[PDB]
C-alpha cells in the first residue's frame, strides 16, 4: 500500500499525515526493513540548510549533551551519579549495586536516572509522558506535542518498547530509533526542531509529529 507513495507526495503532506506514516509503516520487521525507504523519509525533512545546531557526541549521556549543546556531563560523572541513586534508593547492599552497574552487557536505559541527574546537577526539573497518552493526541498529534513542550528549547526522546523505527536522515544512511535508545531535539530561533541522534552524522529538521507516538517525551520545566 505505501510502496506506491512518492517522495514528492510525502513532502506535500501535513505534519499529522507524516506522523501517521511513521506510526503505521516505519517499524522494521524482525528480519526485514520497514515499509518506508530512505527517499520516502527524506520527504519528511523541512529545511536542508546548515544550522548553528550540531551533534556534540551510553546514549543517555549523549542525549543530555546534545540537548544542551555542550559537553555538560562527562562519562565518569554519569556513572558516579547513577551509583549514588542505585545504592540510596534501591536498598541494595552497594556490592549488589556494583554487580548491576558494571555488568557491561546489562547497561541501564532508565528515564528516572536521567531526570534525577538533570535536577541534581543542572537544577533542571523535567516532566515526561508517552506521546500517545497526551491529552487529545487523537485529535492532532502535532498540536498535542506542541502543547506539552510549550516554550522549552530542548527535549529528550526515549523508545521504551519492542519496535525499531526507521527515521529521516539528512545524509546517505538511515539511523533507526532502536530499542531503549535515547535521542534529543533542539529548537532554533525560527521555531524549527532539529533531531540529534548520537549515531548519525548531521542534525535533521523534522516536524515534532515525526516522533513515534509510543515514545516517551522528557521536557524541562
Amino acid at each position: 500500500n505505501p510502496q506506491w507513495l512518492t517522495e514528492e507526495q510525502i513532502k506535500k503532506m501535513s505534519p499529522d499525515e507524516q506522523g501517521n506514516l511513521i506510526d503505521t509503516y516505519a517499524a522494521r520487521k524482525i528480519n526485514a526493513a520497514s515499509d518506508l525507504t530512505h527517499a520516502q523519509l527524506r520527504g519528511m525533512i523541512g529545511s536542508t540548510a546548515a544550522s548553528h545546531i550540531a551533534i556534540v557526541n551510553h546514549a543517555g549521556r549523549y542525549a543530555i549533551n546534545n540537548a544542551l549543546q555542550q559537553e555538560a556531563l562527562s562519562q565518569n560523572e554519569f556513572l558516579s551519579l547513577t551509583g549514588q541513586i542505585f545504592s540510596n534508593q534501591l536498598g541494595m547492599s552497594l556490592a549488589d549495586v556494583k554487580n548491576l552497574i558494571q555488568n557491561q552487557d546489562d547497561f541501564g536505559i532508565d528515564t528516572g536516572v536521567l531526570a534525577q541527574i538533570l535536577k541534581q546537577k543542572f537544577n533542571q526539573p523535567v516532566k515526561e509522558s508517552k506521546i500517545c497518552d497526551l491529552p487529545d493526541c487523537a485529535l492532532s498529534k502535532q498540536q498535542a506535542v506542541e502543547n506539552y513542550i510549550g516554550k522549552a528549547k530542548w527535549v529528550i526522546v526515549a523508545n521504551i518498547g519492542t519496535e525499531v523505527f526507521d527515521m529521516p536522515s539528512s545524509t546517505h544512511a538511515v539511523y533507526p530509533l532502536t530499542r531503549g535508545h535515547f535521542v534529543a531535539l533542539r529548537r532554533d530561533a525560527d521555531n524549527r526542531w532539529w533531531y540529534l541522534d548520537s549515531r548519525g552524522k548531521n542534525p535533521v529538521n523534522i516536524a515534532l509529529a515525526i516522533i513515534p507516538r509510543t515514545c516517551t517525551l522528557i521536557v524541562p520545566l
Binding site: 542505585f86 534508593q89 549488589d96 548491576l100 552487557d105 536505559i109 528515564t111 528516572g112 515526561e128 531503549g180
Partner: protein, 150 residues
C-alpha cells in the same frame, strides 16, 4: 445438640455441636458441608459477631438456637511498584504469581516490555520463574523498578 445456621438467601443448614465447640470448629463443619472456607464466613448471634477463639457456651448458644451466616467476599491482593521518576504503580496480584506475570502486569499498565524491566525487593534482583510467595512478598509490599537492556 442441634443448632441452625441461616443465610440471607433463606438457606438453612443443621449442625450437630457441643457447647464446648469453638467458633473455629463450627466454621470448619460449615466448610465440610457447604464448601465455604472459614475466611469467607461471618457468623452472627444476638446481633453480635462471633470470634474464632470462643465457644458456643461463651455466647449462651443452646439447642435449637439459630445463627446467622453472611459470607465475606473480599478476595484480592495488591502490591506497589516504585520507579526512579517517583511514580508509584498499584498492581492486582496473587501470592502464586510468578515474577514473569508481574512484569506482564507492569507492561499492561506502562507499556514497558518485560525484557527491559528489573525488579528489586529486599535489596535483591528477582528471577522470573519464582513467585511472590517464594520471596515472602506480602500485601502492600513495595518493589523497585529499574530499566535495563540486554
Amino acid at each position: 445438640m442441634q443448632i441452625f445456621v441461616k443465610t440471607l438467601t433463606g438457606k438453612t443448614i443443621t449442625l450437630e455441636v457441643e457447647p464446648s465447640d469453638t467458633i473455629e470448629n463450627v466454621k470448619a463443619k460449615i466448610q465440610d458441608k457447604e464448601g465455604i472456607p472459614p475466611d469467607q464466613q461471618r457468623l452472627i448471634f444476638a446481633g453480635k459477631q462471633l470470634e474464632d477463639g470462643r465457644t458456643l457456651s461463651d455466647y449462651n448458644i443452646q439447642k435449637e438456637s439459630t445463627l446467622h451466616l453472611v459470607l465475606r467476599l473480599r478476595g484480592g491482593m495488591q502490591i506497589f511498584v516504585k520507579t526512579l521518576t517517583g511514580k508509584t504503580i498499584t498492581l492486582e496480584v496473587e501470592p502464586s504469581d510468578t515474577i514473569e506475570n508481574v512484569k506482564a502486569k507492569i507492561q499492561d499498565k506502562e507499556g514497558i516490555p518485560p525484557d527491559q524491566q528489573r525488579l528489586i525487593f529486599a535489596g535483591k534482583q528477582l528471577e522470573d520463574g519464582r513467585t511472590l510467595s517464594d520471596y515472602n512478598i506480602q500485601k502492600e509490599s513495595t518493589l523497585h523498578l529499574v530499566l535495563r537492556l540486554r
